[PDB]
Nucleic acid binder design. Structure first.
Length: 110
RNA sequence: UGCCAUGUACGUCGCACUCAAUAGUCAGUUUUCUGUUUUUUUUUUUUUUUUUUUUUU
């Protein structure tokens, strides 16, 4: 997967219910080096799912949520300046497209 | 206020009520339903009814 994301501009991953690709892919972007110049936007279809995966990877990296890896859903602006992974619902990204058309805040969109 | 010449012709009769009775002509297969009273009123205005599912500076 790391070779795929360092060799392709578009990567696609397929996984079952017990895979963990959702958990590991932001850490794969970390091991490449993404997150530094621009945030890593991970889109989730559900608020509880986005909250759970953000807190899960924060606990896995032994950081409190709202630090390195934080989630933005409706009025949970739970992101500090030292973030690099940003959870968001497709609607929240739909809100940010008009705020910045170029998606310049991010470098990786999951 | 005196007189008035003579003889001169008769008979009998009829009418009514009525009139009756007559020629010939044999037969018609068996079986059937149809049939009767009685309580009477038939008829009365109604109602609210269920739910995949998921995201938005």
């Amino acid at each position: 997967i790391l070779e795929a994301i360092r060799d392709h501009q578009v990567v696609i991953v397929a996984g079952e219910t017990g895979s963990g690709k959702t958990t590991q892919l932001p850490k794969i972007c970390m091991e490449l080096g993404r997150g530094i110049k621009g945030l890593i936007g991970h889109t989730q279809p559900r608020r509880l799912a986005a909250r759970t995966v953000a807190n899960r990877i924060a606990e896995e990296l032994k950081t409190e949520p709202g630090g390195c890896i934080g989630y933005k859903v409706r009025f949970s602006d739970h992101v500090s300046d030292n973030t690099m992974v940003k959870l968001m619902t497709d609607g929240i990204l739909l809100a940010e497209i008009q705020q910045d058309r170029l998606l310049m805040q991010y470098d990786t969109i999951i």
